[PDB]
């Protein structure tokens, strides 16, 4: 648990890798930095070739986060609204979120 503040600040470092996001949910004031990663995901179709869909996730410092790490919360990245669809612990107190686009 030594990492705490330092660790969270370091990666988040804006304009290095941390893209600032704000939780449009009022539970969070004061913009937070987090790592945004999206890639291509190929989803198959039983008969079809499939469709190339895209999935974006936020990796954040959970311990740093105040408020509630909670599903169904509302957040926005770069001005696009995302409902926090899912959260899962990696056990470092650094959780990964999955954000619905809508």
């Amino acid at each position: 648990m030594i990492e705490s503040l330092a660790d969270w600040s370091i990666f988040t470092d804006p304009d290095v890798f941390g893209e600032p996001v704000t939780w449009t949910t009022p539970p969070l004031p004061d913009p937070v930095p987090a790592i945004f990663t999206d890639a291509s995901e190929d989803r198959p179709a039983t008969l079809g070739p499939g469709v190339l869909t895209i999935a974006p996730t936020l990796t954040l410092g959970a311990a740093q986060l105040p408020f509630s790490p909670a599903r169904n919360h509302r957040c926005t990245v770069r001005g696009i609204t995302y409902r926090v669809a899912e959260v899962q612990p990696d056990g470092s107190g650094g959780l990964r979120l999955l954000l619905e686009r809508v």
Binding site: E41, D42, R43, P44, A45, T46, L47, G48, P49, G50, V51, L52, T53, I54, A55, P56, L99, E100, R101, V102
Partner: protein, 140 residues
């Protein structure tokens, strides 16, 4: 005659307002959110009469891929996969299983062989629906 039946299907399923692409391997788009594809599939067969004729057992598979408001045309909760898929499917079923004779004739029986709703996790949620229709067509 697959082309003709597929052509009937092509006319019959072009009505939803979105393009239908069948058997395009390279294509796997997400831009065309509402998605329709019709496949004539396979034909097994047996003899007809003495002196000549053939008939086939054939399956037609219709698949629909969709997201968001395409589900939400009228009634609430079509985001629920089952309601949404059913909502599109029943009308589709009526489209293909329609009263017009030409569509019915080359098809003979048009029974729904199977139905399904499937779930794939995309940002926008995408759901797959299958509507197998069994048509027995006389081999030309």
């Amino acid at each position: 005659m697959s082309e003709a039946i597929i052509a009937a299907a092509r006319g019959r399923l072009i009505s939803p307002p979105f393009s239908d692409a069948t058997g395009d391997v390279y294509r796997t788009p997400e831009a065309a959110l509402p998605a329709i594809i019709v496949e004539l599939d396979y034909t097994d067969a047996e003899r007809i009469s003495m002196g000549g004729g053939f008939i086939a057992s054939a399956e037609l598979r219709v698949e629909i891929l969709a997201k968001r408001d395409d589900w939400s045309l009228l009634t609430p909760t079509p985001a629920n996969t089952a309601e949404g898929m059913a909502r599109l499917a029943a009308l589709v079923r009526t489209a293909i299983l329609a009263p017009p004779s030409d569509l019915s004739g080359l098809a003979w029986s048009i029974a729904p062989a199977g139905y399904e709703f499937e779930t794939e996790r995309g940002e926008t949620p995408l759901a797959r629906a299958t509507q197998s229709f069994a048509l027995q067509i006389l081999q030309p």
